[PDB]
Amino acid sequence: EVQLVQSGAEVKKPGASVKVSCKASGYTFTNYGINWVRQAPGQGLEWMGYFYIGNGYTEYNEKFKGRVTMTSDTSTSTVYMELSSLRSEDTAVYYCALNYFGSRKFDYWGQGTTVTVSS
Amino acid sequence: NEINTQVTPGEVSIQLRPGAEANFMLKVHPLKKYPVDLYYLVDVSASMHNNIEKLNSVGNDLSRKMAFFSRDFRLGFGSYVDKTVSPYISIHPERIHNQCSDYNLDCMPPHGYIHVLSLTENITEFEKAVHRQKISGNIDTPEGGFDAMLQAAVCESHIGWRKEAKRLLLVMTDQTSHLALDSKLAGIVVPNDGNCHLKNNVYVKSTTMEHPSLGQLSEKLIDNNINVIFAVQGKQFHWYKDLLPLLPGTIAGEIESKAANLNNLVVEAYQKLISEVKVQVENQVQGIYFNITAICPDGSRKPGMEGCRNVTSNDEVLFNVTVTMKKCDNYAIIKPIGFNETAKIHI
Amino acid sequence: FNLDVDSPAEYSGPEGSYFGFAVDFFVPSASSRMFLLVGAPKANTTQPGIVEGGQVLKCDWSSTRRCQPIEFDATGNRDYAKDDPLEFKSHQWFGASVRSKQDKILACAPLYHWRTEMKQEREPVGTCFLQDGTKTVEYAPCRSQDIDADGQGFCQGGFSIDFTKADRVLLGGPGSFYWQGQLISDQVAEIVSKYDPNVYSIKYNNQLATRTAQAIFDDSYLGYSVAVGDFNGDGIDDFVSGVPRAARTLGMVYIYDGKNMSSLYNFTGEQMAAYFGFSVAATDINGDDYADVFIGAPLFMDRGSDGKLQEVGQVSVSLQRASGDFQTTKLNGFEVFARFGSAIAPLGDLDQDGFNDIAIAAPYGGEDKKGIVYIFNGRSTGLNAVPSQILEGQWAARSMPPSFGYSMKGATDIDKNGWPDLIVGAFGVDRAILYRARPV
Amino acid sequence: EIVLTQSPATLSLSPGERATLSCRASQNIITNLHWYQQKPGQAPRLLIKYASQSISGIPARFSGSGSGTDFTLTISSLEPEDFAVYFCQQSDDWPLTFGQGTKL
Ligand SMILES: *[C@@H]1O[C@H](CO)[C@@H](O[C@@H]2O[C@H](CO)[C@@H](O[C@@H]3O[C@H](CO[C@H]4O[C@H](CO)[C@@H](O)[C@H](O)[C@@H]4O)[C@@H](O)[C@H](O[C@H]4O[C@H](CO)[C@@H](O)[C@H](O)[C@@H]4O)[C@@H]3O)[C@H](O)[C@H]2NC(C)=O)[C@H](O)[C@H]1NC(C)=O
Ligand SMILES: *[C@@H]1O[C@H](CO)[C@@H](O)[C@H](O)[C@H]1NC(C)=O
Ligand SMILES: *[C@@H]1O[C@H](CO)[C@@H](O)[C@H](O)[C@H]1NC(C)=O
Ligand SMILES: *[C@@H]1O[C@H](CO)[C@@H](O)[C@H](O)[C@H]1NC(C)=O
Ligand SMILES: *[C@@H]1O[C@H](CO)[C@@H](O)[C@H](O)[C@H]1NC(C)=O
């Protein structure tokens, strides 16, 4: 099946950036889009954005707007997310979620990556 | 003329005593590199979801190709299923939810016609309009195609068509369409009036007035200078292919199996559209007969409404117009099918 | 030519009720009064909890001629269980089919929905009500155990009805079997007798019906229009049916046997999307003692003298010959978008000249598109192609077109003077006008 | 923004019982709701798509029903592995949203 494998754990002082990876594998049919979701410790899941692999088309969350950017690599099928202007309230575990077109449910998730912030 | 850049002349005044024939030639000179307004009108059924997938490639592959043929390129978007009364759709509530949950796709209520995106040169607004778009459906197989084609035609300040542009209307479906008198199964018996009825970008006579006839549809496509391309996927390409003689100025293209030729379908049909120049006369005065003869740049002499194919720019297609009179007792307009400029003939 | 224009009988109905969507004559057996029947399928009845159920009225033939509604039904929606309706009668269009033979008034509600016996649904299956004198029964043959678009669930039967002379009745339901449509024919003695009002799907013994077909025949609307007339000399009215979307939307018209529902003959349109099958009639227009087929196609576009396609309408006029083949000539409309051939009304021998006549209407013709009716006379060779008289509706539109001539009915003389008379329904202004033929 | 309110916040039951988990919506999502299971230390795992369809490979005690606004998730026999935090997910419009979860 589709295995989404991310980058390692991170730690970064406030006012910095972080670039997490999510290498799609298994069965890639180019009609999928990689999402990212935030799970703060002891809080619910939080939608960050969307990146469709055919166009490079992006869809973002308005709470995160102006701070999140999603780019990609076509040949290695690795899609990137870059949060900028990090705060201490951004400390969470980040998952990468794979759709297919038209059905915006999260079929595949992969492991997580742990971002820590302060000092 | 001194105004029209394509059809010359633009205004000729002819005085006739009956039993006498008048005669003039009217040259049609096509332009190179028109501005192009392309409005997609997509069937929102569940079978069409691979086709709405392939609408992602419009801003990348199609707009690069159309720069070599046009000077502008503005995209719009619309959506139709069918009229939202029984027996067309299911008016039972949990039959809808079973029917949505079967398709493992995001669904929305079925609708007559929703205008989504006006004509704009931002391809990132076209990609917003595609990924926002969901699935609907009716119960019977035909769709409300021709009913939405007239609302995408007559509503000029809502679709946002330009006068100075080549107006294309890509109709995109895989089934056939209901006709004007299918509506009697729903008790819809008041005829389609032919005016614009978008209240809030939703067609709000979709349950009261009926489907248009092919004569009602074709008179509104020609008065609004709108060129219709049918992009039909399944076996019902041959249905729309056989209605093309009844609908003058319409091109029909077959979407292949994997929809690999959607961007080729708009390119090839726009090539066939400026290659064909034919005319028709609107005659609203009595006792006057027109007789128009087409002289092709090949030299082959065709009837006036047959027109000349393989026309490029720097060709001047000539229409030898002959007008007679039978009895005494206003003006007539002779215009090419698919052009913005006409020719006004006073009597 | 002999119809009276200067003083016809103007009948009126409730506002917005579609008074005149269907018209017929009611002449009882042993009453010696004569009545006009009129359907108002969107008229508010006094039925409990039912909005615009639709009603069939009975208009008298008198000087102070008023129209009284017939109580075919006075009940509300029956229930399957507690707080779960079995059926749905609001907006059911009762009165879209009004048809009468001498004691019997068959009136049908096409848009009737019902919750089926196996699950909860709202399926437009249609019912009909048969008033044979003082006993009213319910006739619902599509309301059965085959329940889907796949089966008879979206049948919408009673969309078109007609009486056979041998006391059968022909039902046309245009939505059965994924809109293949279906004819259903059954004896009137089977309907009145086998009626338990607490049984929901009634089985009939002498019922003749067409069956499923292959999927290429889907969306054809068989039973969109019906007619009766004899076509193989067995003395029994054979069943004629207009099938407007068959054969890739050219339109067909089927003729079935009246005795066992087997296919006798077919017709086929020549232009796609012209509704070949919107109206069928059958009368002996030339007097050869063979019934002649009259097929309207209101959305037919002909080439003008310039080459333009003008949507004028067309009526296929076919004369029956004894060898089995027919002689088809074609009659075109006059004004564009006026829908010539939407209603084919056999008049009988209107002029009393020995040849039957037909009124053909264009419900959106004339000055301000009010509606015209064209009177065509018979001759020994067939039909006279030039009309004899035009009938201009004098009612201006209010909120929809007046639709003069959308329903007509003739071949019944009310004055008992010898020349048959014509009622014309004009439901956009909720009228139903009666014309009286003059002595020649 | 379609706010998905889910009740109860926590739900203390016994192994082998039956559990029901409600989920309301801000507006009509017509079976556009999906259900997820998240054990501690793991990613969320989709259980039911489009409010009633079963993901293959999942034991069929997890069955949902509901439409429009109010949807439910019903566990037949509450197995000891079923105790996790369960989420709703609206797929009707952008932004995609979740419910806050229900511990078990
Ligand atoms: C007037 O026009 C109508 C409209 O086309 C014609 O009607 C069609 O006629 C054909 C045959 O001429 C019919 O096809 C036949 O169907 C029979 C039964 O249907 C089967 O399939 C359905 C659904 O798939 C099942 O539910 C059903 O139970 C049956 O299994 C078949 O038995 C026939 O097959 C045999 O036909 C002949 C027999 O002589 C053999 O030569 C064949 O090889 C084969 O063994 C056939 O398939 C079709 O159904 C009709 N359509 C409709 C709508 O009725 C009329 O024929 C035409 N009449 C005239 C006078 O021109
Ligand atoms: C027609 O279009 C051309 C270019 O497409 C433009 O220059 C011209 O002004 C237009 N004419 C009218 C009458 O809109
Ligand atoms: C135009 O028509 C007239 C009349 O038939 C004819 O004499 C003349 O040659 C025609 N012009 C051309 C260019 O053929
Ligand atoms: C019937 O009554 C309903 C509700 O009172 C109303 O909406 C409808 O317009 C009425 N119809 C007619 C024909 O008066
Ligand atoms: C119907 O009757 C006709 C009479 O000629 C006969 O030929 C035909 O076989 C009959 N069909 C059936 C199914 O009995």
Author numbering:
A (entry chain H): 1 to 119
B (entry chain B): 70 to 398, 404 to 421
C (entry chain A): 1 to 440
D (entry chain L): 1 to 104
Share the article's original sentences.
In contrast, L-TGF-β2 lacks a typical RGD domain and may be activated by other, yet unknown, mechanisms. Both αvβ6 and αvβ8 are members of integrin family, which are heterodimers composed of non-covalently associated α and β subunits. Previous studies have indicated that integrins, specifically αvβ6 and αvβ8, can bind the RGD site in L-TGF-β1 and L-TGF-β3, facilitating the release of active TGF-β homodimers from the latent complexes. In murine models, the conditional knockout of ITGB8 on leukocytes leads to the development of severe inflammatory bowel disease and age-associated autoimmune disorders. These findings collectively demonstrate that integrin αvβ8 is a key activator of latent TGF-β1 and serves as the main regulator of TGF-β in immune cells. To further investigate the expression and function of αvβ8, we generated a specific monoclonal antibody (mAb), designated 130H2, using hybridoma technology.
To investigate the molecular mechanism of mAb 130H2, we employed cryo-EM single particle analysis for the αvβ8 ectodomain in complex with the antigen-binding fragment (Fab) of 130H2. The resulting αvβ8:130H2 complex yielded a high-resolution cryo-EM structure at 2.88 Å resolution, allowing for the construction of the atomic model of partial headpiece of the heterodimeric αvβ8, including the αv β-propeller and β8 (βI and hybrid) subunit, as well as the bound variable regions of 130H2 Fab. Superimposition of the αvβ8:130H2 and αvβ8: L-TGF-β1 structures revealed that 130H2 could block the L-TGF-β1 binding to αvβ8 via steric hindrance, explaining its ability to inhibit TGF-β activation. Unlike other reported mAbs, such as C6D4, which mimic the binding mode of L-TGF-β1 by interacting with both αv and β8 subunits, 130H2 exclusively contacts the β8 βI subunit of the heterodimeric αvβ8, utilizing both its heavy and light chains. The footprint of 130H2 covers an area of approximately 1,000 Å² at the interface, comprising 15 contacting residues: I121, E122, N125, H166, C169, S170, N173, L174, D175, M177, P178, E196, K197 and H200. These residues include the specificity-determining loop 2 (SDL2), which is critical for TGF-β binding. Within the interaction network at the interface, the light chain forms the primary interaction with β8 βI, contributing 12 hydrogen bonds and 2 salt bridges. In contrast, the heavy chain forms 5 hydrogen bonds and 2 salt bridges. Interestingly, compared to L-TGF-β1-bound, the binding of 130H2 induces a dramatic conformational change in the SDL2 loop of βI. This loop deflects outward and transitions into a more stable and rigid helical conformation.
